[PDB]
Structures are given as C-alpha cells and as structure tokens.
Design a protein around this nucleic acid. Sequence first.
DNA 1: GATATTTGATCAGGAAACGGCTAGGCTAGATTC
DNA 2: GAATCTAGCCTAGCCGTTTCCTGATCAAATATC
Lengths: 638, 133
Amino acid sequence: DLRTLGYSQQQQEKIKPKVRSTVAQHHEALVGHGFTHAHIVALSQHPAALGTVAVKYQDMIAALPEATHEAIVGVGKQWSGARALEALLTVAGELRGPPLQLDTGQLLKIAKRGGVTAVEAVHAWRNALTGAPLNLTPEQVVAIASHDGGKQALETVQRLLPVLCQAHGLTPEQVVAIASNGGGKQALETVQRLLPVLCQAHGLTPEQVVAIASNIGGKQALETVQRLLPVLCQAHGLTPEQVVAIASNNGGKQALETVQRLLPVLCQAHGLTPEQVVAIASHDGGKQALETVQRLLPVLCQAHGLTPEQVVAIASHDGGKQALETVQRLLPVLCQAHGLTPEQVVAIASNGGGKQALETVQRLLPVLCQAHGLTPEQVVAIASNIGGKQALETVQRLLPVLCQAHGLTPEQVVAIASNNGGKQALETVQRLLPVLCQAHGLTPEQVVAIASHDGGKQALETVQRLLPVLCQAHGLTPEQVVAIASHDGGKQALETVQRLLPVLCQAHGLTPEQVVAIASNNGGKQALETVQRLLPVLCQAHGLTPEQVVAIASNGGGKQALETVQRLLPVLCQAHGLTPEQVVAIASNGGGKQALETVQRLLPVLCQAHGLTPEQVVAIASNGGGKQALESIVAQLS
Amino acid sequence: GSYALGPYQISAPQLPAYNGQTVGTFYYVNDAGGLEGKVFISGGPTPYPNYVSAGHVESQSALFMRDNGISEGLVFHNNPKGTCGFCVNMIETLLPENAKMTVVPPEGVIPVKRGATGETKVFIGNSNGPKSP
DNA sequence: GATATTTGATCAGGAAACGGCTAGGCTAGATTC
DNA sequence: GAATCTAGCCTAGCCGTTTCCTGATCAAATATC
Ligand SMILES: [Zn+2]
C-alpha cells in the first residue's frame, strides 16, 4: 500500500513488513519538514525514531542550529536513536559551557557513536575528568567517549591512569591511545596484568606491548602472544619482530593461529617463501587472504597467466580476498571486450578497495572514452590509487565545468585527479581558484602545480592562510612558498618553516635560502628537525662545516643520511681508511643509507678478491645509485 | 712528457684523485708573452643547458677561449675513461673560428663505452656558433 | 648501387615512477548482563 | 531486551629509494628498393 505514496518496489522490499504501517502514519509530517524518501527509508531500522523527529524537530534545530538532515538521520538510525536525541535536547544547554565548551559536530559525533549512556556519562563527570589528578583535554575526552562501549573506558581510565602511569611507567598519551579504540576497558585491564610477564620472560619492550594492545580486538592478541610465541619462534623459525607485526592488527589472534597451521603446507606444496607468507598475513583480514591464496593459486597461475609474484602482490593490502575473487571473474571480460592488458588489471587491483575500482572501471570506461575524449591509459592511471572509484565519478561529473568555466585543459584535470584523494583536490581547486587567482596574485599554473600532489587540499588551504605572514614578516618570496608547498606533505613543511626559520637563522648561522632548500623535498620537516638537533654534535665531535651538513640534508631522505653518517663515520674512517670528504660525497647524491652500508659490507671482498683500490669503489658509489651499481655489474659479473 | 705552447714547454701537473667529479687545468698565453693557468671543476650552472658538453671540463675551457678571444690553449683532466662521444662532436662547434685546442687524457685511459677515446686530440674551430637556449 | 634512416655517447639534475607505513570512519554478526 | 565486545573492508595523507627524459652533432649503418 506504499505505492501511492511514491515508494518503488526496491524501496518497499527494504522496509520490514511490521513497520510499514508506521511509515504510512508519519509520512506527511516527515516530508513537510524537508526529508527525502531515501532518508525516510534509512530512518527505519529504529521505528520509534519515526515518532520523535516528526513530533519534535523545531527543538532539535533550536538546540543544534547547524545540524542538517543527514546527521540527524544518522544519529537516529542507531540502536539507541530516539533516546540519544531526547538526551541531547536536555544536555546540550549545559554542555556548551565550561569546562568542555563543545560544538555541534562533537555533540553529534559523541551521540551517534556512543549513545545516551555516553552522553549522560560525559554530562555527569565533566568536572572530575578535566580536573586534577587527570588533566585531560576536551578533545581527548571526546575521542574516548566516541566509541561503542563508552561509560566504561572513562571509568576505567579514571581508576587506572595513575596506577599504570606510576608503577609500570607509561606516558599519559599512551593510556589514552589504548583506551580510544573499541573495547578499551578490556585492553587496559589485560595490559595491567600482562605487562611484566611479557616484558620479563619473553623479552618484549613496553612500546611493542602498547603497539599490539592499541587495536580493536585486544585482550586476545595479548593472550595469544603469551602462548604461541615460543612455539612459532622455535619450531618454525620466526624472529619476535615478525610475530609482533602479525599480531599488531585487527583480528591478530586468527592470523596467528592460521599462520601456525598453514606455514608448512604453503612452504612445501605451493612453493612460497616464509617472508611472503608473513607479508600476506601482516594485514587486516590476514587469514582470509591466506586461505584464498591457498585455494586460488593453482587456478590463477595455469589458466590466466599471472605469475605467483603478481598473485602475492594482489593478496596483500586490506581486503585481498575480495580483490582476488574479483580478478578471477573480471579478467577475461576486461581483457577481451574493452582491450586492457593483464598487467594493467593487476596494477588496478593491487590497492586498497581494488574491487570497487575494477567494477567502476568496467562500468565507466565507454562513457569516459566516448563522451569526454580520454584515452584508456588515462583512465587506468586515474583508477590505480586508493579511492579510484570516487576519483572516476568526480572527474566524470566535474570535467566540463572545470574545462569551460575556468579554462583548464583536460590534461591538467587528469593530473589533478590522480594520486590519493584526487576528488578532494578537484573540489578544492574548483572552489579556491578564483580566490587565489585575484587576491594573492598566483597564476593558474602555480595552483595546478600545488594541487597535483598527495594532500593537495591541505597544501592549498595552508598556502591561502600562510602566504602573507611568510611573505611579509620573514622576507620570503611567493615563488619560494610555492616551491615549498609543491611537494607531498606541503602543510607540514610550511608550518615547520614558519616555526623554525628564526631559530636556525639566529642560533646556527644559516641563511634563509639554505632553509628553503632543505625544506623543499619529500619529508622536509624531518630534515629540518634533524638538522636542528644534529648540527652542534656533527660540527664539534667530528670536523664538519655547516655547508657539508646542508649538502647532506638537501635531498630526499636526508634524516636517514644524517643519522647513518653520525653512526658510521668513526668505524669507516678508522677501520677502512677513508677521508671524511669521501663519506660526505657518498652520502649526498641521493639514497645515502643503502650506499654507505653497501660500501661497508662490500669493501673487503671487493678490494681483496678482485683487486680494486678503495678510490675506485668510492668513485663508483659516489655518483649515481651506488647500491645497484656495486651489488651488480661489479660484484656479480666479475 | 711535454707539450708545445708558444715558446714554453709544459708538462702534466698534479691533479686531485678521481672521486667521480672531474677537475682540470687550463694553460694559455696572455697578451704579454707569458703563461697563465686556471682551474676548472665539472658541473655547475651553465648558460647553455641544451649542449651536453657545455658543462664538461674540456668545453668550459673552450667557451673561455671564446669569451676572451684566445687562440691556443691546453687542458688536462683526471678521468680514467677519456673524452666522451659528445665532446668530440661539439667542441669544434663551441670553439670560435681558427681556434686550436689540445686535450690530454691521463696516462692509462681505457675507453669502455661507444665513442670514447683515450688519446690526445687536436680541435680546430669552425664558423658556426651555438644556438640560443 | 646508391641509397635512407636508425643507431648510442654525461664529467647533470628536475620530474615521474613504484614501493611501503599511520591514522580514522563505518557496517554486520556474536556474546554477556 | 539492552548494552557491549570482535573481525573485515574502505579512504586520505605522509615519508624514502630508484628509474627515465631533454636538447644536439657526426660516423657507421639495417633497410632498402
Ligand atoms: Zn665530455
């Protein structure tokens, strides 16, 4: 009897029979308030909520001025929906004052993910949590209380924070990190009892225990590493680091038991190395991937090609089982109809959520290739990242608008749409191009260059917020700011530059150009902090001018190069006979960690067995890659 | 041993060890009858990035012979590979008209790649000049 | 036959590719008071 | 029934190595009919 209202057959089947009449009862008022039919269908898992939103909705808007329809439906479709809303109406008045001072978004998040019990617990104990002897930031309280299982993590924290932080000895933040995830009460109770046993008998550091106890599903990984560690270590031959890595994910218990039961079978029958098995099992849902591999390896490697290395590559990442099952079905259709090379399919499927990307590619290839003028290679490039489905839909929707209103060529849109989070970069560009192109003075090409990288939205917002201060209070030019923000992680680099420029310039005698050069690479902030920490020691204990340190740090991965130089300078200089100039020449042409260790490991045999002076090997490793030029060509062909 | 430059006789001087970046010494005759020398190091910014040779040792000296309008000179270097196949085609183009240059590799150079040479050569300039970048 | 057209060669240095790890959200089934 | 505890599957954002691409001039040099 729902057809007369406007509900289709598909929507009618979703609604349970025993609630259908109630949907008919409150339809007029719900639509009168501005609710779409899909919203009404969604707000039906909790039938009693259909009686609240219709009856009282003006008070909901009055108490929560910025709330929208989607958030209200999401709050009211949970296991305790009506009661959470009615408690919000009576609590939001007091909860907006001291000592918490929460906003609408935090209230809606805590209600939706914790229920009436969580909101009442936060209201009741809002004074003891912030005050001594706890001193908790409101954000930490919100994070703890925004998980299924609230009103139990808060009390357990209130009881166990001093005892854990005094007797055993942990940083305040580690307890909050443990208690943030679901079921944190059990994790805290288990860690309090099992920390000494693991830290004394099995020789594990407390940081490892915290790392493997800070995931949803705890109290089970800890109880499993306390029993299966010696058997795996001695019978199978795995180092404790591999066991910890396996057990440090969701459902680590199942992964540990599955590995213990399936390692010999895979290592003997199907011909796989243990490292590959550990790599497959070191992710979420590892046991499903292991079982799917054991079942589908012979079929996929005899009828479709797909050498075992490619199968192992697909099997990794979260949800490997879904990717394998989707590939086994969609390989012939994609290869024969649309004309896609199998390695392209393998590249598409070797990412998180590859099943969705494959289905979206199959559905959207003809429209994109026959209604917007795009080659198949561009579509493959778009859908070869994390979230390719969203990027494909966003580019399909937004290509004509960007190509007509703002005069952007399709190649620029393709460049933006790639990477991770391409959709967010596309919407940010559409919103912020006019603002940046007339006020700050940037050209469209500079904005496109900024946005064509991972995390482009953050870089654009940070540039829009920090351009005048850096360009006026520190003497920097806009081109240098664009150069800093071009690479990945531009927000961190810009913030670190603003925070650390005066200190480095006044206390270490560094010109602004050197600071800009250091912070214009991948991971610039780490290089800046490492330079600040390591400059005095590397220039006093060992003879080293600041220019040499800058040269070492002005490359991708300079932090590792600086640490390795500080650790390996004396042994290489004394036990092998190399001038420090040669070490800083090796550690300044990219890489800088592989090359130095390779030189140390290969110097004796290459100098003695073959007959090359240390000068020749230093010259070989200096300019170029180093590791690939020493391991092969010289130490393999000869 | 010794090479002829005007009335003087110049032998091979001392050069740093080969660490992957080439160094060189250039000798010429000033407009007095004397002898002058200058040092060169590979790499660095160049006004002609389109030419591969314009960043090498045996071509920065060639360009220096053109900026000041010198006629004869002599260069050394310390690479146990010789002159690459790019310079043996481009030095004449970069050199001004009727300019003579000699490049002396270190003793024992064994070329390995295609186009490399391990013997002293004489370069004579031609009328053409470099194209603007 | 004479011939046309592909064949590499850096003593450089910026992009562009290809791996890998952290942090956070949402949904469905199972278990305890 | 009410309230809490586990297992898998998806998106954004950030940090380290390794391989590819330019302009340019001159010999030999497969294809070549
Ligand atoms: Zn050369």
